Each structure stands twice: as structure tokens, then as C-alpha cells.
Amino acid sequence: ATCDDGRTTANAACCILFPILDDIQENLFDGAQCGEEVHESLRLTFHDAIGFSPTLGGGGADGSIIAFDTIETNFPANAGIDEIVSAQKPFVAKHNISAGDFIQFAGAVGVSNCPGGVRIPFFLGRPDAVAASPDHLVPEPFDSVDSILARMGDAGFSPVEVVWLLASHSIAAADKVDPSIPGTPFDSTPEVFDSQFFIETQLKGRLFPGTADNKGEAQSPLQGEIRLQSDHLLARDPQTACEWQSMVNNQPKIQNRFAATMSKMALLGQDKTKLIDCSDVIPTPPALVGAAHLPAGFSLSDVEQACAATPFPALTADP
Ligand code: HEM
Ligand SMILES: C[As](C)(=O)[O-]
Ligand SMILES: [Ca+2]
Ligand SMILES: [Ca+2]
Ligand SMILES: [Mn+2]
Ligand SMILES: [Zn+2]
Ligand SMILES: [Zn+2]
Ligand SMILES: [Zn+2]
Ligand SMILES: [Zn+2]
Ligand SMILES: [Zn+2]
Ligand SMILES: [Zn+2]
Ligand SMILES: [Zn+2]
Ligand SMILES: [Zn+2]
Numbered sequence: 001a002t003c004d005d006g007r008t009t010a011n012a013a014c015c016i017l018f019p020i021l022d023d024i025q026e027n028l029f030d031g032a033q034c035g036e037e038v039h040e041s042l043r044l045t046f047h048d049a050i051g052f053s054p055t056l057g058g059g060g061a062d063g064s065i066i067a068f069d070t071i072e073t074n075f076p077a078n079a080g081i082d083e084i085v086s087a088q089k090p091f092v093a094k095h096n097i098s099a100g101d102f103i104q105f106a107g108a109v110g111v112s113n114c115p116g117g118v119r120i121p122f123f124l125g126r127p128d129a130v131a132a133s134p135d136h137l138v139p140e141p142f143d144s145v146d147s148i149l150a151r152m153g154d155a156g157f158s159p160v161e162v163v164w165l166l167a168s169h170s171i172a173a174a175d176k177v178d179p180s181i182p183g184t185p186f187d188s189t190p191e192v193f194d195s196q197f198f199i200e201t202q203l204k205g206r207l208f209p210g211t212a213d214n215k216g217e218a219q220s221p222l223q224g225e226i227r228l229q230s231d232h233l234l235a236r237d238p239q240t241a242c243e244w245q246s247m248v249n250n251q252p253k254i255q256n257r258f259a260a261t262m263s264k265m266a267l268l269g270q271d272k273t274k275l276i277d278c279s280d281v282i283p284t285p286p287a288l289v290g291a292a293h294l295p296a297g298f299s300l301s302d303v304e305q306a307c308a309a310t311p312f313p314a315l316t317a318d319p
Contacts, residue, residue, distance in 0.1 A: 014124060014278035017105065020095050021281060024106055028087065029113060032283070034191040036183070038110030039172050040084035045107035045266060046168070047072075047081055048100070051133025052155050052268045058133035060155075060269025061126065063099025066092060068132035077138035079176040100126035104266040108282050111262075114171050116193040117285035118255045121263040123275035141177060141216030141228040145237045148230060155268060157261070163243040164257035165265065166234065170197040174226050177217050181210035184226040188295060193285075195254060195292050198247040199315065200225060201235045203295075203302050221302070222295060241306035249292040249313055293318050 002008050003015035025032040028041070044065065051072070052060035065072045066085055073082040092102045101124055108120040139148045152162045171193050175182040187197040205219025209226055218232035235244045247254055294302070294317040305312045 009278065009280050011276050011278065013276045014281050016096065017124065017278055017281045020091070020097065020102075020105065021109060021283075023095070024091060024109055025113075025283075028091065028106060029110055032113050034110070034114035034117070034171060034193075036173075037084065037087065038113055039190065040081075041088070041103075041106045041110045042168055042171065044081065044084050044088070044103055045262070046165070047078055047138055048103045049265045049268045050139075050152075050155055051137050053134065053137055054154065056134045056137070057131060058137060058269075059129060059131055061100055061104055061266050062129040062269050063092075063101070063103055063126070064129035064131065064133050066099040066103065067129040071132045075133075075135045075138070077136075077140050097124070098126050098128050100129060100270075107262075107266075111171070111193065112283040112285045114191065114193040115286040115290060116251065116255070116288035117171075118193070118259040118262075119279060119282040119285060120259050120266065121277070121279045122282055123267065123270070123272055124278045125275040126270055139230065141230045143230060145230075145233050145239060148234070149239065156264070159239050160243045161257075161261050161264075163234065163240055163247065164254075164261045166231070167193070167197070167247065167254045167258040169228075169231065170194055170254075172197075174228070177226060177228065178208075178210040178214045181226070184209055184224065186226065186228070186231065188222060188225060192288065192290060193254075193258075194288055194290060195248050195251060197231075198235070198244055199249075199292060199294065201227060201231045202245065202248070202304055202306070202312065203298065204304055205232070221298075236304065236306045242309060245305075245307045245310065245312055249315065251288060251292075 001012035048065045049061035051058035092099045108122045111117050169186040173185040189196045203221035218227040218229045220227040234240045296318040
């Protein structure tokens, strides 16, 4: 199909997304860059979608975190999310798509700006949200592995899928874990969707980048990087450590599994067969530039290897 401005897409219903794409690329993503608002928009896709429990309710990827922002943004696990919700709200008001569609569209567009990134499958047509998520549905960085895997499993994700989703932490920072050092990233390349997060979380912790007693924080290996306790444990626990290590210097697996599992997450509470595939509106991501490495001065002895079956791969260090 050909849209009014000459751009093409498989289904004509998708044409409405093109002015939305251009607006968010400039005005939410700072000119199609992989910066703060991409990272916050990607976090928003998960905090919207994981509000989904067969027992307790919540409609999953339904825009509830925007439609019922007064309730959801005050949940403790949603600390700091009000900023991206307030930034996205005027776009939803101006354009003619539902909040649930907008949150997943913005997350997919954002990720596509990141070198190494992927085009997350995107489907159009979610109805407006009809309930707020229950509290206590979003995993917290001081939750146990058992807790996190039980919560994610309740929403439909296996332990390997949790690891795959956490490739998101390769383009991510924290503002509320240690409020003395807001904006501190989880890996050394927060504007590159790469395996550095899976490498750097496996290094021996050395320091606290800000203060020393924050709930849900573990020691980091690097000044200028922050480590969550949940990531420390997921990299080391016998249920997940082998999958975690399998991501290291495995860019094709990171890409393939993150895209597939993000699509599953973006469809929680929805029926793909009732929606329209508009995946081809999402931009082509740039390539990695771009090689997996240990930080300068580090060696393989600094890796806390946690997979009994497979030795950690031999990486080189930056000079
Ligand atoms: C599995 C359990 C998870 C836990 C415990 C967790 C925890 C956290 C925490 C504590 C922060 C920092 C919030 C702040 O202080 O500002 C964060 C940020 C973030 N999370 Fe995760 N997360 C999890 C899973 C995921 C998933 C599945 C995604 C996929 C979309 C995701 C995407 C992000 C992104 C992109 C950020 C960066 C936000 C920014 O830069 O402001 N998280 N997460
Ligand atoms: C059950 As919970 C996700 O608030 O630790
Ligand atoms: Ca929701
Ligand atoms: Ca990265
Ligand atoms: Mn942030
Ligand atoms: Zn910006
Ligand atoms: Zn519009
Ligand atoms: Zn509407
Ligand atoms: Zn709770
Ligand atoms: Zn709790
Ligand atoms: Zn908890
Ligand atoms: Zn365990
Ligand atoms: Zn480096």
C-alpha cells in the first residue's frame, strides 16, 4: 500500500503511523537518537505490559499506565516512571491511536535507533485500557530470583525468556536506585544495544558509584556504572547463569530472542489475530560498530564465572 506521502507499508491501515513516527523521532527521541527517552520508553513497555496476572488481574500491554497514571505511577516499583508517562501523554492526546498502541510503538521506534538494535514486531489496534494494573506486579531490584521468575512466569515467561528480556539493560540507566547519581547506566555502552551488559554484570564488583547502602543495589565493577542486586543474582544463580553467559559475544542471539520476546510481551492481554501487523513502519536499526570486550585494565580473572557446563569466553580488553 502507498500512503498519502509516498511511503509504503504492507497494510494500508498502518499509514496512520507515519506522522506519529516522524513526530516521536524528533520530539520524543531528540532526532532519532538512542538516549534517555528511548530507555525510559522501553522501560515503559515493560511496566505497562507486566501488569498482567491471571489471578490478580490487569490487562497487560493496554496503556493502563498512562490511562490510570494517577494510580499506577504511585506504585513503589514504578518510581520515576511518571516522567516518561507525562512526556508521552500529549502525543497520545494529539494522535489517533490508543495509549496501549502508542507505548509499544514508541518503545519499538526507540529501540530501532540504537546501534545493534532490532525491529520489534509491532501490531496496531489495541482498545483503550479498562482497568488499572494491581500493585505488586512489577519486579523490583531487591526481589529474589525465585520471586522474579515466579512473577514473570505468572505472566507467561520462562526463565530463559527473562534473561532474553534483560538485554534491555544494555540500553538503560537508573535514576531512583541511588538518587545521588541519577542517570548512571547498567553497562558501559547505554546507547548501544550490545552484550556489554551481560559481560559487565559478570565481573567482580569493586565499588559503589555513589553511596553505599541503597536497597536493591550491588557493587559495580566500574565508576560510572550501577549494578542492580537482581542482575547480580540473575547472572550467578544456577537457574539463569548459563543462559546469561550464553548471551556474551552472541549478538545474533541477543537480537533474535529480544525481538521475539518483546513481541510476546507487547501482546500480553491482546490477540494478535485481531490486530494489524505494522512492523514494517519501524525504522531499520543501525549495526553494531562495535565489539564485545572487557573494560580497560581488566582480564578474564576478573570474571566470576558461574556456568559449570561452559567456560566463559575468552574476550580481549579495551587498550
Ligand atoms: C526482570 C526483572 C527486572 C527488574 C528487577 C528491573 C529493574 C529495574 C530498575 C530498578 C531500573 C532503574 C529504575 C530507576 O531507578 O530509574 C530499571 C530500568 C530499566 N529497565 Fe529494568 N528491570 C527488570 C526487567 C526489565 C525488562 C523485562 C525490561 C524490558 C523492557 C526492562 C527495561 C528497562 C530499561 C530500558 C530501564 C532504563 C530506564 C532508564 O534509563 O531510565 N527492565 N529496571
Ligand atoms: C510480588 As512483588 C513483584 O511486588 O515482589
Ligand atoms: Ca498495563
Ligand atoms: Ca550497551
Ligand atoms: Mn532514566
Ligand atoms: Zn532528550
Ligand atoms: Zn496524528
Ligand atoms: Zn482514542
Ligand atoms: Zn510488592
Ligand atoms: Zn515487596
Ligand atoms: Zn518485590
Ligand atoms: Zn536460585
Ligand atoms: Zn569499553
